[PDB]
Amino acid sequence: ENLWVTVYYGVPVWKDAETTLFCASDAKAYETEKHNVWATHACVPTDPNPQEIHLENVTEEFNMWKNNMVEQMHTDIISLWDQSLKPCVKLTPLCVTLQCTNVTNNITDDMRGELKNCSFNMTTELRDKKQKVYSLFYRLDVVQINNKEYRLINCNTSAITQACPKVSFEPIPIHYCAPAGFAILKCKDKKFNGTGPCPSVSTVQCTHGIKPVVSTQLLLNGSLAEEEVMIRSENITNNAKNILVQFNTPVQINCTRPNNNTRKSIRIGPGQAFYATGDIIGDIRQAHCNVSKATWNETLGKVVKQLRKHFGNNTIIRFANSSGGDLEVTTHSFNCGGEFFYCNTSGLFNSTWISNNDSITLPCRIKQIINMWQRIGQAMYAPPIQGVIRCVSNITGLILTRDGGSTNSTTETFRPGGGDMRDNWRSELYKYKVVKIEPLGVAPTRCKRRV
């Protein structure tokens, strides 16, 4: 009848608790190296075979929009880019006026200035003497001031820091591991929309590989839904809230920079080289991404079927191209092998859906001065890539947006949109919750310590 307190150690109980997750990178320097802007060397080796334990009987609750696993990965990548852009050249000497001339002129096309041939004065070697140099600039990075004179788009508002040409920009999968005494709970649901109970939970030491690829309007090289297209929004009745779609089957997108560029070195100071573009060997072609017309068509009819589960079974859903903003929010901007593309995704979102081989070429264009996103008076110059760029990737989702007017109207317009790379991390980490394990317990057992 009488009971006594007995303490147990190692009892299964946990609480949600934000902590400092670290790295595990499977792809350490495989005798190949070429340090990148990320993990590589510094991220702890990953397990050959991770352990996953299926917690039976247990129904946890997930909220994909109050996750601190993505508010910590957001600042882990702003500071991985800062720490790799501090130890290399600052292009402050390049705020001279440039005497740009169109590379083609009366050469081809409508006399378009897609490329400019800009010559300027610079102090090579000695700080007194300055010789006349030249380089090839894009029309997106020179602002006419008034064979007129130009100037770099950036250097009245931001400070340029040339990216160190030895680091690689190819994303490497990253596993976010948790210290000892903490665990990450994985929702093994196949139809999970990031909020509400998950009756099939699991315990993992750290997440799967997460490529830190940042893009806008289209989530490339991501993870795919297991069963169906999944629509996830913070507040599906708010127009100011983005919508994150997730494809069950990838849509392959090929694109190139078919111009055989050539990097050339300009000495901006003693022991400091500016890597400009010398010339183009061959015909001057235009960059572009290719998407299958039929595969996109059927994958966009799967999205409209799920969009009808939240916007009425009987409604007309039409997609339209992005309205306004920076070139990164109005265009599908990505980074293909160290080269930043801003593709015109107006042929993709040009449809209208009512309730009951061929390719699409998207004219991308290249930028060389890149501003940081959530905004600072800072920019990065990406040195030219010497060669022909050609990368292929998977579209695994969209970042959509709605426009006001759905109060009396019987139609929905879905412009694409990006520009916030916090919505890039939560399209991957949506199913992970970090918990902390409390291993001490008491309970009446009718023991008694022997005196």
Partner: protein, 123 residues
């Protein structure tokens, strides 16, 4: 089986698998800084309940029977509806009002049979 595998099992069935959880609680760039505070934070958190488990006398044990009664005003349940009916998380949520009271009784009752055994050692 596995770390936290008996999380949804009743209190009785999860007491057989203590050593699974107990053996898992220990295990200068931006990566180095956050990999170095994960190690420090994991030894100071593990030493926090080793010290606690030592002022109660249960130093090298996973189950320790103490000399303090249950008081029946902390939880007036049976010994069968507690050990096969309630999981550890449910029991913790129910008894969370009196842990700081039970914890203070566990160490004030251990440094009382530590002086009683010290007095008995002289006789």
């Amino acid at each position: 089986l596995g770390f936290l595998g008996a999380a949804g099992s009743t209190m009785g069935a999860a007491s057989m698998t203590l050593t699974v959880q107990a053996r898992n609680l220990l295990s200068l760039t931006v990566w180095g800084i956050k990999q170095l505070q994960a190690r420090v934070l994991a030894v100071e958190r593990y030493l926090r309940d080793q010290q606690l488990l030592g002022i109660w006398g249960c130093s090298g044990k996973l189950i320790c029977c103490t000399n303090v009664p249950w008081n029946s005003s902390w939880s007036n349940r049976n010994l069968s509806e507690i050990w096969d009916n309630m999981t550890w998380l449910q029991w913790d949520k129910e008894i969370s009002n009196y842990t700081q009271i039970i914890y203070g009784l566990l160490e004030e009752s251990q440094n009382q049979q530590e002086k009683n055994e010290q007095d008995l050692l002289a006789l």
